[PDB]
Amino acid sequence: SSYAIFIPKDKRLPFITIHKNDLSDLSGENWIENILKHHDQLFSVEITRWSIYSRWPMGVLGEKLGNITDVEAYTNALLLENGISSSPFSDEVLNCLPPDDWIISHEEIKKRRDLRNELIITIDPETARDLDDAVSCRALDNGTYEVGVHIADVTHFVKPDSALDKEAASRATTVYLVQKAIPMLPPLLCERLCSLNPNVERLAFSVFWKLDSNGKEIGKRWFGKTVIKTCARLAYSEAQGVIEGKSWDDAVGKPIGGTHTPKDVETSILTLCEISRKLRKDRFAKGAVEINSTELKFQLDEYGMPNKCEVYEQTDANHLIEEFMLLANRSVAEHISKNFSNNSLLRRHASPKEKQINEFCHFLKSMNFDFDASSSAAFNASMVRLRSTFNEELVELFENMAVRSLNRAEYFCTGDFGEKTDWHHYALSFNHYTHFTSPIRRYPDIIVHRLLERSLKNTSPGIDKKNCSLVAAHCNEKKEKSTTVQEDSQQLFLSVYIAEYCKKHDKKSMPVQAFATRISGNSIDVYISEYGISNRVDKTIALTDRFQVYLYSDYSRTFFSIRCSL
Numbered sequence: 001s002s003y004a005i006f007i008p009k010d011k012r013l014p015f016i017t018i019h020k021n022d023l024s025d026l027s028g029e030n031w032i033e034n035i036l037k038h039h040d041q042l043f044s045v046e047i048t049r050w051s052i053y054s055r056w057p058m059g060v061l062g063e064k065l066g067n068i069t070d071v072e073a074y075t076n077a078l079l080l081e082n083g084i085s086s087s088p089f090s091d092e093v094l095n096c097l098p099p100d101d102w103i104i105s106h107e108e109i110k111k112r113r114d115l116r117n118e119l120i121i122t123i124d125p126e127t128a129r130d131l132d133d134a135v136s137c138r139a140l141d142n143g144t145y146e147v148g149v150h151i152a153d154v155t156h157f158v159k160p161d162s163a164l165d166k167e168a169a170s171r172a173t174t175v176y177l178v179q180k181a182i183p184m185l186p187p188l189l190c191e192r193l194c195s196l197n198p199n200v201e202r203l204a205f206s207v208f209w210k211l212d213s214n215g216k217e218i219g220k221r222w223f224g225k226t227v228i229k230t231c232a233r234l235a236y237s238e239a240q241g242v243i244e245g246k247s248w249d250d251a252v253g254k255p256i257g258g259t260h261t262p263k264d265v266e267t268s269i270l271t272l273c274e275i276s277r278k279l280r281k282d283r284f285a286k287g288a289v290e291i292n293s294t295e296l297k298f299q300l301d302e303y304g305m306p307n308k309c310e311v312y313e314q315t316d317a318n319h320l321i322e323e324f325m326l327l328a329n330r331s332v333a334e335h336i337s338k339n340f341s342n343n344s345l346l347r348r349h350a351s352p353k354e355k356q357i358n359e360f361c362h363f364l365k366s367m368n369f370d371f372d373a374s375s376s377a378a379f380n381a382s383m384v385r386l387r388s389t390f391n392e393e394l395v396e397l398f399e400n401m402a403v404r405s406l407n408r409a410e411y412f413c414t415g416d417f418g419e420k421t422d423w424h425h426y427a428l429s430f431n432h433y434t435h436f437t438s439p440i441r442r443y444p445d446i447i448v449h450r451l452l453e454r455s456l457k458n459t460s461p462g463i464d465k466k467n468c469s470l471v472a473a474h475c476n477e478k479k480e481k482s483t484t485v486q487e488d489s490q491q492l493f494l495s496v497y498i499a500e501y502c503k504k505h506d507k508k509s510m511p512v513q514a515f516a517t518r519i520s521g522n523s524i525d526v527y528i529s530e531y532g533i534s535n536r537v538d539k540t541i542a543l544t545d546r547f548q549v550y551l552y553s554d555y556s557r558t559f560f561s562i563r564c565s566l
Contacts, residue, residue, distance in 0.1 A: 004035055006045050006059060009072070016045055016059040024061045042069045044303075067500070068303055070556030074492055075177060077558065082481040084175055086182045089167065096164035097188055098157050104201050109227050115206070116229040119260050119268055120150055122196050123321055126235035129181055130174070131195040132440040134204070134230050135324055137268045137275075144218060145211045145271060149328040150228050152194035153203035154439035155449045158185070160462060165446075169471065172478040174441035177489040178296075179304050184441060194440050198233045199257040205449055207328050215278035221331055223456055231257040232265060239317035242269050273316065276323035283326075287376035287429035289406075291383060291399045294532040296490045298497065306497035311396065311532050325437045326428065333432035336451045337423070342415035343461035345447045345468055346434045349409040349426035351376075360405035364398075366518065367544060376429050379406075393529035393546075394515055400532065408480075411435075411444050411472035415465040444475050494531055495560040498553040512548035514564070516541055526564065535564045 004023065006016040020027060026034040044062030051058070079086050120136040132152035137145055158165050168184050175182040183190055196202050206226040210219025234252060241251025248262035256265055284290070292314055299308035329347075337344045357373055364371040369389060372378040383402060387395055406427060411434075417423065425433040436452070439445040447463060454462050463471075501509045513530035522538045526549065541547065550565040 004031075005056075006043070006061075008045075009042070015056045016047060017054075017056045018045065018059050018061050022060040025063070027061070038064070040069065040073070041065065042072060065303065067496075067556075068305065071179070071305065071492070071496060073557035074555070074560060075179070075489060078485050078488060078492075079175070079182070082485050084182060084478075084481060084485065085171060086175075089186050090163065092163040093167045094186060096159070096162040097186060098193065100188065102193060104203060104227065108203070111225070112203075113206070113224055113226040115148075115150070115204075115226050116201065117258065118148075118228070119258075119264060120148070120228050120230045121232045121234060121265065121269070122198075122230050123234040123236060123239045123317065126237065128176070129183070129190050130438075130440050131197060131233070133321075133325065133437050134196045134228065135272060135321070137272045139268075139271070140210075143212065145275070146208055147211050147272070147275065147324070148206050148208045149324050149437065150196070150204040150206045150226065150230075151328070151437050151449075152196060152440055153205050153225065153449075154185070154189065154194050155205075155446055155453065156203055156225075157189060157193055158439075158446060160450065168443055168446065169474070172443045172471075172475040173482050175482045176486050178298055178306070178493040179300065179489075184443060190440055196228070196230050198230050201227060201229050204228045205452070207331055209327070209331070211275055213274065213278070215275055215282055221335070223332070223335065223452060225453070229258065231260050234317075236315060236317040236321075239269065239320070240315045242266050243273050243316050243320075272324070273320050276320045279327065280319065280323050283323075283429065284380060287380075289376050289380040289383070289427045289429070291402045293403045294396050294400050295487070296494060296531065298490075298493050305500055306493045309494060309497045309531060311530070326430075329434055329436045330430055330432060332436040332448060332452055333430075333434035336434075336448065336455050337414050337432055339455040340414070340451060340461045342413075343463055343465060343468055344414040344434075344451055345411055345444055345463075345472055346414055346423055346432065347409055347411050347425065347444070348423055348433065349428065350407045351426055352406050356405050356407070360401065363401070363517075376426055393513060394527070396529050396532060397515070397527045397534070410476050413465055413468040413472055416469055442475075444471065447471055491533065491562070492555065492560045494533065495553040495555045495562045498551055498562060499555055502552075508550050508552045510548060511551050511564075512546075514547055514549040516545055516547075517543050528564070533562070535562065537564055537566050 002020050003017045004020065006018055008016065020031050023031055023035065026038065042065045044065060045059040046062060048058045048060055118136055118138065120134050122131060122134045124131060134150040136148040136150065139145055158168065171184045174184045204226045206224065208222035209217055212218055232254065238252040242248065248266055256262060294311055297310055297312040298306045301307040333346050337346055352373065361371040361373060369386065372382045386398065390398070409425065420431065424431055434448050435442055435445045436448050439449055450462055454460065498509045511528050511530050513528045514526040516524055516526060518525055524537045524541065525534065526537060527534050528549065537549065551562060552565070553562045555561065
């Protein structure tokens with residue numbers, strides 16, 4: 001009892017014990033009271049020794065972390081203000097889990113389709129914690145391809161109406177903050193049995209198409225439970241290299257498992273890229289309206305503070321994966337909404353309301369441009385035009401605006417509408433659509449997986465109309481908070497990165513990517529393409545002119561703010 005207990009924010013480390021004499025700055029004088037007037041702050045510590053007769057290891061207190069304490073406290077209040085639970089999982093949830101020593105049984109591989117000898121890969125942004133989607137592309141003896149999308153079998157461990165399923169249904173989604181993720185499911189799931197890591201056996205839920213170089217299905221689709229063994233884990237920046245010409249050594253310095261070779265894997269990536277160039281050249285012809293919003297990507301330091309900040313730009317590798325996730329979502333929506341026309345969970349997008357339509361066309365006019373919104377086709381066509389009239393920096397903003405202008409997509413029950421025409425998804429231009437490829441971070445995807453499997457066992461939906469509408473409406477609300485805190489946590493770290501730059505130097509972080517729109521003195525409204533994010537300044541300027549600004553910021557723990565001047 002001459003020691004103090006230090007609990008790391010990192011749950012992977014154990015408890016660390018520091019001694020009354022080792023509290024550095026504050027210790028010694030009624031130290032049990034100093035470590036109590038400091039019960040909120042976060043500190044640094046350095047593990048010293050771990051004696052084979054010490055349960056917990058020893059350490060020596062470092063400095064107080066006022067800045068980190070500040071960041072973690074805002075993040076904590078933002079999650080509460082929005083009703084997102086971020087506590088540890090109850091003991092009733094952790095007991096509906098399979099045991100830590102769970103393994104794929106031979107009897108389980110036997111009632112499934114065995115794909116462990118197939119060439120299956122995963123591609124992801126190189127962060128986050130989720131790994132539940134994978135892809136494959138086998139060339140056939142005709143000039144045909146057996147493409148496949150392989151999703152983690154979350155509903156093999158997550159059983160209907162269990163405590164574990166009730167807590168997931170309540171969270172309804174995973175929340176992605178800049179410095180961490182609030183999981184919908186426990187670690188044993190996100191990290192192991194439902195993570196498609198390489199060179200390891202995982203259970204999955206696959207979909208197989210028979211395609212050609214134009215993208216047209218030339219064979220019957222296939223759904224069912226599979227066993228897979230992904231052979232590579234790529235990143236978009238790595239997968240983008242293989243597409244622009246680079247080899248599988250420079251672009252991707254990792255080994256490959258199974259009998260597959262760096263060559264066997266590039267040709268099956270490059271085929272997936274050409275096919276996705278077709279499918280996507282087909283999507284825009286049926287009316288689809290793909291814009292691209294803008295989100296921030298940070299690089300964090302040893303303490304977890306922003307150390308780099310860029311606007312993340314989507315690439316060809318990105319559009320290659322989306323195109324087959326869209327396809328897997330379409331195919332699964334169509335299938336279940338034709339065996340269960342009243343109990344299926346689907347997703348739809350509606351045409352914009354003139355309130356958030358014409359009032360956006362107006363803004364387009366302000367800069368001397370006419371926008372056409374009479375259809376989906378007209379909307380995308382107006383955006384393809386648009387991109388050929390204004391700058392590339394301004395292009396970022398308007399696209400982001402377009403998004404805000406277009407309606408929000410929403411889950412719904414097929415039983416509540418009866419008419420297929422209402423199932424339509426405006427932006428995608430699909431007649432059927434749901435969410436299927438992310439059951440580890442979404443809960444609607446878990447209902448759809450159970451509906452798909454129940455349409456494969458020739459059985460009843462398992463879920464009813466009322467309870468389906470209940471999920472659809474709960475996941476719609478929870479996902480609007482989730483999206484709100486996610487962009488707000490990105491704006492918080494922008495304020496911190498700005499502050500933790502002028503604190504390493506002085507006065508403000510000077511940006512020159514300001515454009516001008518529009519009026520109402522004394523107030524100009526600006527858009528700093530660098531970092532995206534609109535702002536305001538309150539010997540001549542006018543709308544469309546570009547100039548350098550200021551960007552000053554202060555933050556935490558109840559507020560953050562980014563403010564620019566001239």
